[PDB]
């Protein structure tokens, strides 16, 4: 699964 801390700038639930 993706690591959400790889790029903190990325909100994975935003388009």
């Amino acid at each position, epitope marked *: *699964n*993706p*690591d959400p*801390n*790889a*790029n*903190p*700038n*990325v*909100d*994975p*639930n*935003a*388009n």
Partner: antibody
Amino acid sequence: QVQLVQSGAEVKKPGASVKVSCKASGYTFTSYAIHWVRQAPGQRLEWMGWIKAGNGNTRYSQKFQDRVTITRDTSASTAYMELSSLRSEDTAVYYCALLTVITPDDTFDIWGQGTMVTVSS
Amino acid sequence: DIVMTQSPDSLAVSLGERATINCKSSQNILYSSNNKNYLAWYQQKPGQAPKLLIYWASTRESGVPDRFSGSGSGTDFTLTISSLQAEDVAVYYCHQYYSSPLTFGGGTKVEIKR
């Protein structure tokens, strides 16, 4: 307009260290993470690490964790990357960047103009 | 590391023609739970920093022309320029943000022929 403005090009001797700065403007400094990416001549982009501007938390590529320190000064709205024990393979353009800022509201990606560091006697 | 491999390393087509760039990841970067591919495409012109064109593999950033299109899922991705404008002469890079370290492909140099 968000802007990232970096320090000027430098030459440094092998074995010495270099500290590049990255002044941010146009947004709330503490809200995002600044990344450092380098590009050796003729070669691909290489991610070095990020720093969260608000808490100062850091994450480093394994390739660089032994020799790189990323720091920030919220009062100056500036991030810094220090690379120690310089070697000829470190000659490169070093960028700071707000990489892939994907927010519920907006999406933006902003880079500094780059700083060429030459490792030479 | 998720290694990003681009193909071809260089291509040349005419103004108006279609340019295709392939990127393959060493690992699946699709998350089934949100159906998102953690991939971006960048454009880099000589002496400048890279410019974001596509994110989530297929989403164009605002301001990016509709002739740039991203496609693909899992480990196989494609950037297409439908009608090349001579300014599109640049190096194109894939990028994954699925896991650390963040990584980039080797780049695809796009040149023009008459």
